Amino acid sequence: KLPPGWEKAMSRSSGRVYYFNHITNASQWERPSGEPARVRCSHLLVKHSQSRRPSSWRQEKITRTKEEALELINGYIQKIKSGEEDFESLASQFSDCSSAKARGDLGAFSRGQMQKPFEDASFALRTGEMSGPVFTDSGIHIILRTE
Ligand SMILES: NC(=O)c1c(F)cccc1F
Ligand SMILES: NC(=O)c1c(F)cccc1F
């Protein structure tokens, strides 16, 4: 029936069925469509006070809470999905990762190199698809699979 990773869910505010992926935290209205040695991803990282290194090019001392970081991530996802903003533009401006200078691009990678909730979400995304909030010891990520 459903591809692995996906489940049916019910909207609380409309009652309409939707689909949720518990590996990528993606959610969508349509029934999902459905592994390679390597994938290529970009990401937008929002750090918080419990990040492994709570500092970034944006801020010497990152002091926001994980709850505040998630609210920021959720707001960026809204703007990307509505088309008000582009993923690459938000990553260049607001990602707490050094990859901000490359529009969030991390290049290609294999299994065994990234933190593993990042890796699992990356390889579960289809080409062009974007994750929901993904949690690692670095912070909270939005992941875009580009290849
Ligand atoms: N976007 C979110 O914060 C989220 C949620 F509200 C429920 C499940 C998974 C999620 F990533
Ligand atoms: N792909 C990357 O990891 C990267 C880059 F291409 C340029 C600057 C910083 C980075 F982390």
118 & 91 share domain: yes
* 52 shares a domain with 1: no
26, 61: one domain: no
Tell me the β-bridge partners of 139. 136
* Shortest-distance Cα residue to atom 8 of ligand 1: 25
Residues 25 and 42 in one domain: no
CA-nearest residue, atom 10 of ligand 2: 99
Q: Do 136 and 89 share a structural domain?
A: yes
Q: Say which CATH number the domain at 7 has.
A: 2.20.70.10
96: its two tokens: 């707490």
Please give the tally of structural domains in the chain.
2
Ligand 2 atom closest to 106 (CA): 1
Q: Do 137 and 116 form a contact (C-beta atoms < 8 A)? A: no
* Ligand approaching nearest to the C-alpha of 99: 2
Q: Which of 127, 104, 118, 109 lies closest to 39, judged by CA?
A: 109
The domain in which residue 7 lies consists of 1-32
Which burial class, exposed, middle or buried, applies to 7 when counting CB atoms under 10 A from its CB (0-12, 13-18, 19+)?
A: exposed
Residues in contact with 58: Cβ distance below 8 Å, sequence separation at least 6, in sequence order? 94, 96, 100
Given 43, 48, 56, 122, the catalytic residue: 43
- Same domain flag for 9 and 26: yes
Q: How far is the CA of 17 from the centre of ligand 1 (A)?
A: 16
Name the experimental technique: X-ray
For residue 37, CA distances in Å to 28, 30, 109 come to 27, 28, 8
Same domain, 103 and 128: yes
- Say what the resolution is, in angstroms: 1.7
Q: Are 123 and 17 a contacting pair, CB within 8 Å?
A: no
Annotated active-site residue 41? The verdict is: no
